[model samples]
Target: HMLTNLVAEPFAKLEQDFGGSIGVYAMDTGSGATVSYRAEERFPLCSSFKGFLAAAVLARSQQQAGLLDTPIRYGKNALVRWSPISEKYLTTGMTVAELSAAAVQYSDNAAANLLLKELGGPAGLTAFMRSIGDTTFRLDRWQLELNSAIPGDARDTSSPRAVTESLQKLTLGSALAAPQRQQFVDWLKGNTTGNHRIRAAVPADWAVGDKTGTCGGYGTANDYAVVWPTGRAPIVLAVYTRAPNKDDKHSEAVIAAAARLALEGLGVNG
Candidate 1:
């Protein structure tokens, strides 16, 4: 009760400073203690969904033998804006595993689209989330289209609490099988796009893996992560943000500050 207020105070100041709404949810895996603010509010998943998208592919891999090893050939037509990794491999298509990694690590648009189609598109991925007990995640559109991020629209959005809880299950809980779990963690650990978000708040020696999303409008952006302190159980958290206007810019620094505050709320040493 008192602890909730302690965490809520700073977060209140933070959202106004960023000129937007910030939603956060953090959990201590060891104690199950949490710090939540606007935890149930909807925020655009942005590219952060790519992380779960990869997880879904990994989940499918468990039932489909050689699924990860399967080679997928794609052409220029498959490429979309912001496909930094996939565009480079157009001539020789990457394997399913490679595409998953690229989607998680680089937020590659084309790789994500290819994988989403392979998973049967938006509803299929949403179905996977449902299968895993996440009732708040909903993906209604494909890439480029999903990034609209209209304030009232529910397409491609999730609550911070749901994101954190779902992330915990997939990354550190029993939702994924052991081998697939480790692979998921490894791929998340290798993520290259979130250095300025949650990763910025994490300590130098502590291990962290995260996914970032920037929607480029309405100040919509987000990050979610798993952090492993040297001597403590891992922590899982999610932070999301949005503003009132159409042209507002998202702040990576705001996300970092929010993450830092979340860690403080949980009594994890800096």
Candidate 2:
């Protein structure tokens, strides 16, 4: 708490300097503790929802359910209108795994929408959340529901604390069984969204498995990652923001700074 408070001034200035709201957390997984820094009272999940969706997929996979190997058709017609993954080049037909990869790695909205459909839409995702014992999260404005015809649903939101807790379970291999666990971890290890927060600071050769989130118009961006060098201790970091519309510079730098500092303090020998 001391460290979290101490960083608030800097973080505030950072928000002022960069022009947006920012929330960040770094944990010493080795110690199962939080670093001395102020986390958001309620950090928005933003696009970080993908990580949870991924977790749900892995967890379901463990139960011999939601294998998602079905080959579905959705090429140019299914692409995002303005995103990097516009219909121009996407294939109409892909397996569940391919759609999962595209939705997660590329932040492909279409792919995510399709996956949500497979997951039983909003109600299904909400039920999945309940199964995992989440109580503080709000689903009224969950994006999955709003983007579709699904009513009485909103974008999924979570705080930094909740995300870290979920990540803790993920790191412990509790979310999936052994063989599937390896595969799930491997998939996250090669995620495609690389322009934000933790992944921005990760070294190219070392493993810095991560997923990123950003919503520029809403003045929010969030990122979370499980960081580990081949022979180094692992760390879990989640950085989120709800800032002014103009704050855009050095977002990644802010997150990386926290990550590097927290790791060093945790007695991570690297």
Candidate 3:
């Protein structure tokens, strides 16, 4: 009850201010202190699945020669309205590794679909999820198909618990080799998206590596990160927010508030 209250205090206040529920899971890698509020509840992951998909691809890329570097061209079906890649390089071929970077850092829908296809479709990602001991996380569709997801549609989804668990493994090198883990974290650090969320409230000296997920018109927004505060061991945090309709600024502010509360709770700052 104490731990829950500790985590819930910040979240309760954040919800009061933000006018939407949030799910959070935070862990201290050194001391193994973890806090969660509604961490078990599943929320649509949207493009957040790109991180796991990158992991899946990089895992195999480590074993297979040139797996990441191999170039593949996109057909007409690969075109998606919201894709940067589709706009610029629809006809030109790109390496699988390039696709992975764009998928994570840029949140490119076309690039994500290409990586998903190369990973052998939804089953491939599901297999990786099972290997990581996750059950509630399901990546059922590609980015293009997400637009049609209704209130109860079978869309890609996950929990704060699952995301933080995976992030812990990633930072600790339990799920990836040391070098691969380094690369993975580097990619996240290089993320050009979601600056208004988890990284918004952290100190300037801290290193925040994160991924953001936006669930179309469903109003779901999420940020997952491995934050390395100065003079402290790394911490993992995942935050999710949803409203009646999409409001990224409000959702992003909630995530920011959660990060500030999490940092204070973890004793990173006063």
Candidate 4:
């Protein structure tokens, strides 16, 4: 699909300024309008996969009664860098639901790994995506390891369109049961790590829930969100970026700018 120059030109300039490629996909569920730029291009998922990880647990909860309340105890071996929530609860352990919350809200590495274990592993998570009709979404590795963001390596990657679609499925679509969907939206809404990315582009009155991914290499990072504009249908969008040079830094501002462009393309008011 080709994008009109009105939409494509600014994205070209935006990436040029950032010294990287930016992928965006936004869908207005009300009118079914969309804006796509490199929406099909692959970008490393980084910690953003944790959001979906939490959803998979919620899906399992539907069939396995009391799964969310089950307490899980993890030893020091489960710990990893950037595991803020998990590290704090290492001595006391946490419930399956609590671990899922940490993984989504704090981007807690250990919490993600613990939930990945519960889901069977990276392959298992990928299977869950397939079950949800997301052909492009895949989780090939665990936290920290999955954040490599090596150029051209397809591991732990998905297109912006796929992320947004899957997110819509879990949060607003029927991929998740009603209760599970609300819980997923709530976890993403409370995310504390994405303010500088997509959240910066949205207005304060809108209800927005997002998950962020920061891979500490190759200037790779991303944010995917579901935004509710008052009196209108919600919008689901994904913004992802990556640079060729390993030392290049990712820009949260670029993501925000791109999100603004996406909303404009869809004729969605700020």
Candidate 5:
């Protein structure tokens, strides 16, 4: 049931590639304590911040006895420029459930902003942050306005340790109820709009689901997700980078490395 032994090699490898600043955390949903590589280190969440926002909204709605099925509107009227939702939905109508798909699946800025609005505002998300015991993780005033006026500095952020822990809680069915938890996991499984990173590293049909973030400036990038293999369990991973030459390939490399480490730990691979 212990994972410390399994993580040693992965941790070592991660440290070598990205140096000591790199952070990682993996938890076997079947059993044991979480694994890590400088997991305590803080990194700009990049777009991975939306995962927390998604979880928070789901949790808060659960707390309020809200329904995920509640209908919402989506179309050209609700779209925002430079947002993934615009690419996917373009001009289609959807419900809260469907919009959540765009928000989490694609990491669509407009869909996420709309959800942020539905869940209340940045302030409400702030309260959700506090509830999860994350005080240092900051959500910018206009987190939904990143393409324009929002500063290069303005961002929704989190550390590896916090994100992994939060995800662990949710996986364990503590943060959300049975139905909501199932819904979130399902949404994660259906997420397919991002460039393949964690998904490409894992086996086909393996439950590899999560959100990602990258930027051209400030040298920020990330891929955070929970990979669960059939008849086994889930492993939560958060990889962050601020390298001068960030790209989708780098993110893929990190996820592959982490997955290799985790598979070995789980005895799923050599």
Candidate 6:
């Protein structure tokens, strides 16, 4: 439990700085060391599920070639506030590849919804989750509908351990085809969100790919990543935080600090 103690010190510091419960699950794939704080506790996944959704699309495309190239009209009916395509681009038609990029790279709710709808709603995502042996992860609702769910009815939810394992599976080539796996990792590497969290805390030159999630009413802020440190093997890091208040900066900093601590605990230098 020395690693646990190492991780605990920073988390205790985080609790003092920001009053909330933080969950962390990390693994050094090369060394096979795992660390966690409340790793089994469930929290709303927010947009982080987009990473699995992206993997689903890419993996399915391998069996059905041209699936990613298939185009669709994401009409205004699909638009919702807090969406990049809805609020910024104002465009209607895009291929599956474009929408997947928007969802994974920009965390676009509208694009996420489009992909979710195409894949047959949240059920599709859950199916993929089960395939990967992740029974704890659930995508019960779309991004636009997440805000309206009643208390205790999470839009999408998963535990820190569940997400870390999923990411680890993706990284280790157990969950998807080789081509799609590379493509999925490439897409995550292009992510523009969470720049101030997991990516910020790690060494600047380290290669990191992650998905970030934020939900105010659900009191959720999260980031999960597959980090490849220079001269070290890849590691899976997942951080989930919840607070009664929705100050994102607090959660972001907590996650960033946790990453640094987890790396140190795993005996991996920045």
lDDT (0 to 1) per candidate: 0.91, 0.61, 0.78, 0.91, 0.63, 0.80
Candidate 6 per-residue lDDT, tens place, 219-238, comes to 46889999988887898989
Candidates in order: C-alpha RMSD to true structure: 1.4, 4.5, 2.3, 1.7, 4.0, 2.4
- Residues 1-270, model 5: lDDT tens digits: 244655456456574575324566666666665566666656666566667677776786666664466766555655665476545655554566666777777777777777778767777776777776667566665454453212234356667767777766664546777777777777777777544565666788776677877654434566777777777666776666554333312355665566566556556642
Winner of 4 and 5 under lDDT? 4
Instruction: Give the per-residue lDDT digits (tens) of candidate 1, residues 1-270.
Output: 544535444898999999989999999899778899999999999899899999999999999979999999998889988899999999999999999999999999999999999999999999999999999999988884446788988889999999999999999889999999999999999999999999999998999988888897899999999999999999999999999999888999999999999999998897
Give the C-alpha miss distance for residue 26 in model 6, angstroms.
Answer: 0.4
* Among all candidates shown, the one with the greatest lDDT: 1
lDDT of 2: 0.61
> Which model scores highest in TM-score?
1
lDDT of candidate 4 over 1-270, digit per residue (tens): 343323443888999999999999998898777888898999999888999999999999999989999999989989988898888888998999999999999999989999999999999999999999999987887664535679999988999999999998899989988988999999999999999998999999999999999988898999999999999999999999999999999999999999999998888789
Per-model clash counts, in order, read 0, 22, 0, 0, 0, 0
- Tens digit per residue, CA lDDT, model 3, 77-120: 88786677555777788888888888889888889888888887
User: What ranges in model 4 sit over 4 Å off?
Assistant: 1-9, 144-147
Tens digits of per-residue lDDT for model 2, 136-198: 454433343223211112345666666666665665446556765565566677777755567
Arrange candidates by lDDT, descending: 1, 4, 6, 3, 5, 2
Residue range with the least summed lDDT across 10 consecutive positions in model 5: 145-154
Model 4, TM vs. native: 0.96
Candidate 3 C-alpha error for residue 204, in Å:
2.1
Worst 10 residues of 3 by lDDT: 1-10
Q: How close is candidate 1 to the true structure, as a TM-score?
A: 0.97
TM-score of each: 0.97, 0.79, 0.91, 0.96, 0.78, 0.91
Pairs clashing within candidate 3: none
| Candidate 2 Cα outliers beyond 4 Å, as residue runs | 1-13, 36-40, 75-77, 82-92, 139-155, 244-250
